[PDB]
Amino acid sequence: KWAVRIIRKFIKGFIS
């Protein structure tokens, strides 16, 4: 659970 946020973490590196 909530490991989807890890992919969003990559997004946090992509958007920034």
What does DSSP assign to residue 6? H
The Cα 4–Cα 11 span in angstroms is: 11
The Cα 12–Cα 5 span in angstroms is: 10
The Cα 10–Cα 8 span in angstroms is: 5
The Cα 13–Cα 3 span in angstroms is: 16
Which technique was the structure solved with, according to the deposited record? NMR
